[PDB]
Amino acid sequence: SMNPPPPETSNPNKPKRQTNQLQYLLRVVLKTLWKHQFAWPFQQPVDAVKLNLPDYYKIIKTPMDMGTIKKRLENNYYWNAQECIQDFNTMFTNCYIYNKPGDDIVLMAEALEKLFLQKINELPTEE
């Protein structure tokens, strides 16, 4: 059981709402990154067992990925848009913590992050 369980994606005890910013985060931000050429390593949790990287979860204690983020948005897990934005930022930061400059995965993360920032710079207004 070398991998940790994946992050929680649903919780019936948290209140739920739909906001225009949350719609944008799923329909524009997540979907645009998801289809990107470099999205695939980030579409599910890092499988440290299959990659045979037993130090990954020794280093990364707040894992996050777009598969999880997608489910969180679909399940109304986030109340505030910033909770979702923070999950994206955590995902990128983890990649930068574990890997090194010049690694293909870092270039991939940098490209996705630039696109992410372009899209959240056009986040719609709050209710």
Ligand SMILES: CNCc1ccc(-c2ccc3c(c2)[C@H](NC(=O)OC(C)C)C[C@H](C)N3C(C)=O)cc1
């Ligand atoms: C059939 N399995 C396909 C697959 C292979 C590798 C990865 C994957 C996921 C996460 C990460 C990796 C691979 C990185 N390995 C690597 O060779 O990256 C290439 C593919 C760019 C290392 C690092 C721990 N990392 C992250 C996200 O930090 C995902 C799916």
